[PDB]
Design a protein around this ligand. Structure first.
Ligand SMILES: [Zn+2]
Ligand SMILES: [Zn+2]
Ligand SMILES: [Zn+2]
Ligand SMILES: [Zn+2]
Ligand SMILES: [Zn+2]
Ligand SMILES: [Zn+2]
Ligand SMILES: [Zn+2]
Lengths: 93, 659, 596, 596
RNA sequence: UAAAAU
RNA sequence: AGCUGCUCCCUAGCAUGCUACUACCG
RNA sequence: GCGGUAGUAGCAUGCUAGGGAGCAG
């Protein structure tokens, strides 16, 4: 992507620390969640923010790698799932 | 984007440490000797706690080859070493030979940047990236059971209720949240600033402990790799084991590569793996497989010294020395030497491999390297040290399907573990001695000689700034005369004078306690430190063996007998075909019995019964084997010569000084 | 490479390589098979020949193991052992094998060529494992014989699919049938290159022949076609799982009062769940099929699989099921085969549906609650073991009529089989008892029922519904226009023309023929969609037409005649020259100018 | 490292290092090549050299197998035996080697110089493996002859197209050709950095040359230009797949009836689907390309590739093509090269639209249903096999007339190559026909084709609107006053001095001449633009004045002349000595001292 | 001389 | 799916060494 | 009848390589 080249050109030298490359320039984020309260305190709702950017949720799976919808993620339905979920979100503009 | 941060460190230094009369170098590259490297990396440890943790690690850069853009690392920002730039980078090339293919494959840069962003809440460890669209979970299947042997052991009266020996070691299973929930244990690793002045002398004493060896660079055609088939780290495990690689390279590719690391830096990627073996505590155990690229060099750089250590007797280190043929007795005798009121003691470091602060790891690498006085230059040695640290200290662990950063601690399975841990152990011991000695009412010590010793010790430690040799030698002699240490890779035994230890002239145990506390961030309950007053019975335990004084003919010898439950367990639980129908595996039991011989000479009963049990079982095994083989064909074998295996004497030979 | 003795199940490592199928044999058994038969070459972990180059003494009884290796009489080492020694042959576990007395009939099996019912009559009455081996070698001999047919080449091309072919002079020419396939080779010099698979069928005249191809390749003149052979897998499952009972019904669950139209059969429904398996004999397709589907309904949640051998059979069955079942149904039937089309409804491959229909040879390898084989009066013990191997369920039900049509098993040409000996369950029905029976027609006009009960049955049926419009013009058989020995008689259609038009509404009937090619020619001067008597046995129709070839043995077969005429509901007509049967049939024959 | 013999295809591990390409020779074949030629060095997994240091003897015939090494006669250890014996050489699989006796022509190729016709004549007349080897070889020879060039020194940087580039001394300067694409470097001091590529050509005057760069990086007086060089890759696919015929089209979906103005083309279009590939004979601008686009229309639901080698050709093709095509198109040619601008339509890299348009060395490993290539009169067998290697479509098609001009193949010095052997498919089209002749013309006037079909063609192509004033002012050539090597025909241009003003309405022409310095000295005595055959291929100037050079065939190169005719809309003047050629271009015969 | 195979 | 260290067992191969008897010369 | 050069088979040592298994950190 051109934005990578861009942030390269912003370097006073052309060398940048590795850790911040994917943080700013990735096109898709994956988050691993253990427990329900924790989920509530992060990607609750259909979109959220992280790392000064806006991410939108789409497609959520479980430990058994089966799809699950956001509806089921209640407080008391939670003891019915392979419960360290994987959430894949997209870079929203 | 900012990653330099130099005059910031200098500004901090000036605002606080204004009169610390010694030049500070924000980048160890500009250090003089090594002691300057220590005295600078120390301050760096403290200062690096301030800056963003998303600004350490590899320092990548865009390059071109054959009119094509790549991203490769050209340097590093060590939270203890400052900035380091690779010295031989080449923009714009036409093609790629083999070594460069390799060094661009074993790097995280191109891997990471081609990954999707990861944020996990399972661990407080700073995650980095993921390479797939689905994290993986690995389990640990349960062991397989060998019945007929169990029924046998029952039939001959074992395992009855209230018996002394019973089953305690087994094959614990592990579910799916094992790898990560284990790896998380690095949360016990903290940035700790170790006292520098006393370190600058304990390192001298430790060095003195290693005078009688020799090492240096060696040419590729001289390395020795026992067992050429082990996993090849990441991602080389996508092709084959080591032999494939150790073959496709010339004897110069190795030399070219080695001489290339002596001026540039190569990040790596470590893998975690779940050990699958019997144990006694359900918490799983794991191992770190390192990339081929680091080993292939660290070998050439250390193997000379290593082999120099693995073949010397009577040394304070005891690695490689075999216990058979009475050797164990030699060890226990020499560790007695001549201490005036000998007591024995041992201890153990809780989570020794995680809790090790980075400073001591660097200290160990320095002490090892100090032998290279000539097989290198002096910037070469520093770049070597840098590549080492970057490969086995803050490298990117590849757990599950994701890359995290390892804040510190020893990588469980590098090239130089066992020796490094031992060096660390000796360092801790010496530190405890120094602390205890300084920390006593100097006006109450009676032996005038010791009082002068303590005085001049403090003097040489805080006042004088340059190394003294004579006092170092005198002190080393004093320690070898009143603290005698047999060391292994963290596992120790100390024979020390009691009278002095009472008057706080050598470290007791509470000294060890305070030391681990204030220099290792952990606490060692005296529930595992063992003491011992009567030498006639050997040390309480060492490498998981007990010691017993048995009359072997005319005289008395120390012998190591293991823990019976362990042996029984090894008899009863295995991995499928193994042992199950063990009528093809006798050698297993041969060796096992070998390990369980000394239980014959034991005061308590059931012990020797274990031995006789193994014997009779071997006999029944071979018998019912021949019976089947006869029917299979129609004529038994011509000459088995296996009967010797079930006569006791042959085992006895494995413990007598003549081979 | 060991196993069990086909006669003693003892451990061994031998196979009578001289016998075709290489069966495992105990020591003593091997000694006896070899001493009493031209069968001599024994194979073990290695072959048994003299290892000295040149010596080819392969009669094992002459050979000697030398040092590790085997040797003749002459080239023997100074020290050795005689192999065929002491009423036994040396093999692994020699001192353990027991041996027994089934050797005579064994060699009888292995030595027959399936030419006379006797070797059959024994094939169906030996021990089960032996029965298996028998079926194996039978099918193998069939395949091997199939190779004996000639080769075909192209002579000149006529159209896209019209062609003139050239046969091997002096070789058996196999028939034009959808059950034959030919690999096409053309040769450059060099470059004997396969071109594809091609079936055949007779065009409108000789020797214009049509062909269906695998790809759109252009044809040439230096081309030829080899009928493609086949292999045969070995089997290991028994024919019949050991019969059992229980004290109470398990696994399956009735409803309550649903569908009383299936009333009386509930009695049978319980006892079916009460056994491990059972059989049912019934005159054509009456309670047969009807009862099967009724039971299927009875236990709703029961996962059920139907299967048979005849494609048209399973097709008629699946449509009858469609008549009454949730859909919620599939017939996972045919992959890249189905030369004749069949099922039209659902998938061919997911094995999720509760009510799965398919053909035996195309079955998957799956489990279910119960399974209902059908038309056992046609299958061979081979197929029975096949289905018991591929599938695995609790309750089995086999259905058929030992008066129907068995497997052709063409190879036999001397004598005839008693139906009792078609296969195992055939015996079971004919021997002890069919466990459950049904005796009434719900499908056929009463008059033909009377005729049949007067014939092959012992006047033991009843039904409903009588008239009309039935005849049996004993029209002399015109020219047997037999293309191959497969029969055709065009002047037989020479009166169909007189009912190709006189037919007021007999326009949607089905025509039936003793032979396939006379059936094809019926499709030529078309009247309607026709079929073969074998491809029948599964469906009924209001009107049906029937013309016959000559009075050949295949034709005048009473069973073929019965199962043919028993496929009609209200109208029927059959035309044989007929010296006797029209004396047995009860209709109203006419004369060529008398057709109303 | 191991492979099949280039002649007998035997699995072998030998390479004649004395052969430039190091091919794989079987044991026997290697023995023959070495005993026959001066190729006296053979490589296996290792070279065959006396391993005794200092003894630089290399050939096999004096080398002896050492204990585990190789040694000369003098240096051979006691037990040491030579390598080459029994007509065979010590090599792997030496048991199964077969060899062959065709070492003759193979040798001739391993020794030819590629400077003369007979080399190439043999080349396009041998076996496939030998053909590919010949292509590899001649291309490598051209590569090293290119390497014979050198760098240069920049005098000044005049303009973005005007540049001052003196060539390094002691080196044959690379002339003014688009082919001379040079890797430019801006020497910091330091900095072996390629600033891009820049190629050069003769503009409207010298010695200020014109240069185009793939990047507009402005040069200065300090740069230096190396000749871009690399290594030829070996090839695997044959020149062409064997042709296949079909009784129908394979997966082609013909259009119903859209844009039937290409109707005479659809009669041909379906033919494509019947043949694995085919060929096409046609003048450019005719159904040339037009046919291909109408074809892509005729099957509008199919992946199609269009390829050429010249970017001028891919622009002449891709434009006119996007016309009748949705856009919605693909012609994604150059990622990061192309000395000049190229495709302008979409994306570079995702093989999207069913119709792609690119150049040979840009075609990646992609697939289609049909691949099409014009320009066949120009590419090499090397190029054909490259095409086959990069594409795996289900159909292929070849367009072009050998009447045009082929690859430069500079090494030709003694003799000329016939279109008869330009390459394989061309050798066929000229030895068996294109199987499709294409007509007719479109742009040019009739009079420039009605007489020009009397030369290469057989009065075959037709056009109309013959006007205006297309004549041959055949002027007997003057003396030879050539400034550089190529001819200065200023007396020949002395026919237009009295005519630059006699044409007030024809002040819109363009000078042409074969020798490029005949373009140069005309550009000196210029008043109207110039354009030679070189940068042609897909354009037309309204007026043009053909100016001939020396009577040598360089002037009336009937191919070069013809193509110089075919690129016109209105008028032309032809001025040559011309004893016989003018009897084929029939116009108003005009003279020069007379103005009629 | 009748059915009819990842 | 690691880094070492010790130990047993099996197999091959090389070379030595040694033994002797069998063959050539002294 | 001895000494030196050629065989045999045997024995001893060792060294390499290859393969299996177990224990300690
Ligand atoms: Zn410093
Ligand atoms: Zn060194
Ligand atoms: Zn036999
Ligand atoms: Zn038997
Ligand atoms: Zn023999
Ligand atoms: Zn060859
Ligand atoms: Zn030499």
């Amino acid at each position: 992507n051109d934005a990578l080249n861009n942030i390269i050109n912003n370097a006073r030298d052309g060398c940048v620390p590795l850790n911040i490359i994917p943080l700013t320039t990735a096109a898709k984020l994956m988050v691993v969640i253990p427990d329900y309260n924790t989920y509530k305190n992060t990607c609750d709702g259909t979109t959220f923010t992280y790392a000064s950017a806006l991410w939108e949720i789409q497609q959520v799976v479980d430990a058994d790698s089966k799809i699950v919808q956001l509806s089921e993620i209640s407080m008391d339905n939670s003891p019915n799932l392979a419960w360290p979920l994987i959430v894949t979100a997209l870079r929203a503009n | 984007l900012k990653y330099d941060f130099t005059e910031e460190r200098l500004k901090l230094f000036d605002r606080y440490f204004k009169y610390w009369d010694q030049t500070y170098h924000p980048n160890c590259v500009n250090c003089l000797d090594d002691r300057c490297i220590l005295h600078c990396a120390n301050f760096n440890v403290l200062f690096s706690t301030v800056f963003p943790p998303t600004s350490f690690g590899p320092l990548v850069r865009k390059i071109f080859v054959d009119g094509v853009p790549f991203v490769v690392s050209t340097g590093y920002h060590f939270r203890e070493l400052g900035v380091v730039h690779n010295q031989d980078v080449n923009l714009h090339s036409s093609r790629l030979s083999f070594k460069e293919l390799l060094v661009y494959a074993a790097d995280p840069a191109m891997h990471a940047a081609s990954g999707n962003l990861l944020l996990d809440k399972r661990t407080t460890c700073f995650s980095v990236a993921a390479l797939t669209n689905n994290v993986a979970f690995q389990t640990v299947k349960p062991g397989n059971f060998n019945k007929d042997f169990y029924d046998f052991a029952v039939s001959k009266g074992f395992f009855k209720e209230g018996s002394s020996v019973e089953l305690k070691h087994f094959f614990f299973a592990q579910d799916g949240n094992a790898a990560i929930s284990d790896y998380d244990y690095y949360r016990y690793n903290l940035p700790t600033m170790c006292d520098i002045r006393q370190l600058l002398f304990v390192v001298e004493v430790v060095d003195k402990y290693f005078d009688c060896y020799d090492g240096g660079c060696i040419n590729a055609n001289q390395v020795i790799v026992n067992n050429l088939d082990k996993s090849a780290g990441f991602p080389f495990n996508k092709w084959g084991k080591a032999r494939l690689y150790y073959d496709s390279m010339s004897y110069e590719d190795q030399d070219a590569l080695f001489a290339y690391t002596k001026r540039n830096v190569i990040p790596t990627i470590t893998q975690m793996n779940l050990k699958y073996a019997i144990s006694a505590k359900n918490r799983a155990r794991t191992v770190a497989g390192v990339s081929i690229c680091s080993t292939m060099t660290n070998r050439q750089f250390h193997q000379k010294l290593l082999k120099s250590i693995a073949a010397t007797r009577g040394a304070t280190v005891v690695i490689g020395t075999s216990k058979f043929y009475g050797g164990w007795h030699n060890m226990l005798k020499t560790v007695y030497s001549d201490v005036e009121n000998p007591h024995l003691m041992g201890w153990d470091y809780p989570k020794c491999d995680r809790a090790m602060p980075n400073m001591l790891r660097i200290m160990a690498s320095l002490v090892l390297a100090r032998k290279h006085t000539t097989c290198c230059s002096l910037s070469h040695r520093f770049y070597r040290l840098a590549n080492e640290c970057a490969q086995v200290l803050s490298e990117m662990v590849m757990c599950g399907g994701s890359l995290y950063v390892k804040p510190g601690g020893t990588s469980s399975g590098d090239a130089t573990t066992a020796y490094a841990n031992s060096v660390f152990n000796i360092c801790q011991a010496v530190t405890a001695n120094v602390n205890a000695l300084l920390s006593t009412d100097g006006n109450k010590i009676a032996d005038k000689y010791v009082r002068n010793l303590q005085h001049r010790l403090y003097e040489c430690l805080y006042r004088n700034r340059d190394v003294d040799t004579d006092f170092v030698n005198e002190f080393y002699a004093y320690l070898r005369k009143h603290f005698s240490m047999m060391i292994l890779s963290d596992d120790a035994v100390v024979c020390f004078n009691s009278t002095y230890a009472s008057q706080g002239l050598v470290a007791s145990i509470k000294n060890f306690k305070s030391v681990l506390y204030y220099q290792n961030n952990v606490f060692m309950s005296e529930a595992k430190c063992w003491t011992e007053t009567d030498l006639t019975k050997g040390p309480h335990e060492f490498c998981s063996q007990h010691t017993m004084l048995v009359k072997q003919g005319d005289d008395y010898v120390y012998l190591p007998y293991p823990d019976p439950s362990r042996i029984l367990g090894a008899g009863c639980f295995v991995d499928d075909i193994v042992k199950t129908d063990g009528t093809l595996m006798i050698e297993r039991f041969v060796s096992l019995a070998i390990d369980a011989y000394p239980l014959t000479k034991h005061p308590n009963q059931e012990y020797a019964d274990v031995f006789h049990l193994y014997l009779q079982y071997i006999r029944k095994l071979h018998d019912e084997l021949t019976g089947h083989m006869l029917d299979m064909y129609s004529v038994m074998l011509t000459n088995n010569n296996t009967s010797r295996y079930w006569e006791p004497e042959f085992y006895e030979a494995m413990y007598t000084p003549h081979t | 490479a060991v196993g069990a003795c086909v006669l003693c199940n003892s451990q061994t490592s031998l196979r009578c390589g001289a016998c075709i199928r290489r069966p495992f044999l105990c020591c003593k058994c091997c000694y006896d098979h070899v001493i009493s038969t031209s069968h001599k070459l024994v194979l073990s972990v290695n072959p048994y020949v003299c290892n000295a180059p040149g010596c080819d003494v392969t009669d094992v009884t002459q050979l000697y193991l030398g040092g590790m290796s085997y040797y003749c009489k002459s080239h023997k080492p100074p020290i050795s052992f005689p192999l065929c020694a002491n009423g036994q042959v040396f093999g692994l576990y020699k001192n353990t094998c027991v041996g027994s007395d089934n050797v005579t009939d064994f060699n009888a099996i292995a030595t027959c060529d399936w030419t006379n019912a006797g070797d059959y009559i024994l094939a169906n009455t030996c021990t089960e494992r032996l029965k298996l081996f028998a079926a194996e070698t039978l099918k193998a001999t069939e395949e091997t014989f199939k190779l004996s047919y000639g080769i075909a080449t192209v002579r000149e091309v006529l159209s896209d699919r019209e062609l003139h072919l050239s046969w091997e002079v002096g070789k058996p020419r196999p028939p034009l049938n959808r059950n034959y396939v030919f690999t096409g080779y053309r040769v450059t010099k060099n470059s004997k290159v396969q071109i594809g698979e091609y079936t055949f069928e007779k065009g409108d005249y000789g020797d214009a022949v049509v062909y269906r191809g695998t790809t759109t390749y252009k044809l040439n003149v230096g081309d030829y076609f080899v009928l493609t052979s086949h292999t045969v897998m070995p089997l290991s499952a028994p024919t019949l799982v050991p019969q059992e009972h229980y004290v109470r019904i398990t696994g399956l669950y009735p409803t309550l009062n649903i569908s009383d139209e299936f009333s009386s059969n509930v009695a049978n429904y319980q006892k079916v769940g009460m056994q491990k398996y059972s059989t049912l004999q019934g005159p054509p397709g009456t309670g047969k099929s009807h009862f099967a589907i009724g039971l299927a309904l009875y236990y709703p949640s029961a996962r059920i699989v139907y299967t048979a051998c005849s494609h048209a059979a399973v097709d008629a069955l699946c449509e009858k099921a469609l008549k009454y079942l949730p859909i919620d149904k599939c017939s996972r039937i045919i992959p890249a085969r189905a030369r004749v089309e069949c099922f039209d409804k659902f998938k061919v491959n997911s094995t999720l549906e509760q009510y799965v229909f398919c053909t035996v040879n195309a079955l998957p390898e799956t489990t279910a609650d119960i399974v209902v084989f059908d038309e056992i009066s046609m299958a061979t013990n081979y197929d029975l073991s096949v289905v018991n191997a591929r599938l695995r369920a609790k309750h089995y039900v086999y259905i058929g009529d030992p008066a129907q049509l068995p497997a052709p098993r063409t190879l036999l040409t001397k004598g005839t089989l008693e139906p009792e000996y078609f296969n195992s369950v055939c015996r079971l029905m004919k021997t002890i008892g069919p466990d459950m029976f049904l005796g009434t027609c719900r499908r056929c006009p009463a008059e033909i029922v009377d005729t049949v009960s007067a014939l092959v049955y012992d006047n033991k049926l009843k039904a409903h519904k009588d008239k009309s419009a039935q005849c049996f013009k004993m029209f002399y058989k015109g020219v047997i226009t037999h293309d191959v020995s497969s029969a055709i008689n065009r002047p037989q259609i020479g009166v169909v023309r007189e009912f190709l038009t006189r037919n007021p509404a007999w326009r949607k009937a089905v025509f039936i023929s003793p032979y396939n090619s006379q059936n094809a020619v019926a499709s030529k001067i078309l009247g309607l969609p026709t079929q073969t008597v074998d491809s029948s046995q599964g469906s009924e129709y209001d009107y049906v037409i029937f013309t016959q070839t000559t009075e050949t043995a295949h034709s005048c077969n009473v069973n073929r005649f019965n199962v043919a005429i028993t496929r009609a509901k209200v109208g029927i007509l059959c035309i044989m020259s007929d010296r006797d049967l029209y004396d047995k049939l009860q209709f109203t024959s006419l004369e060529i100018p008398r057709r109303n």
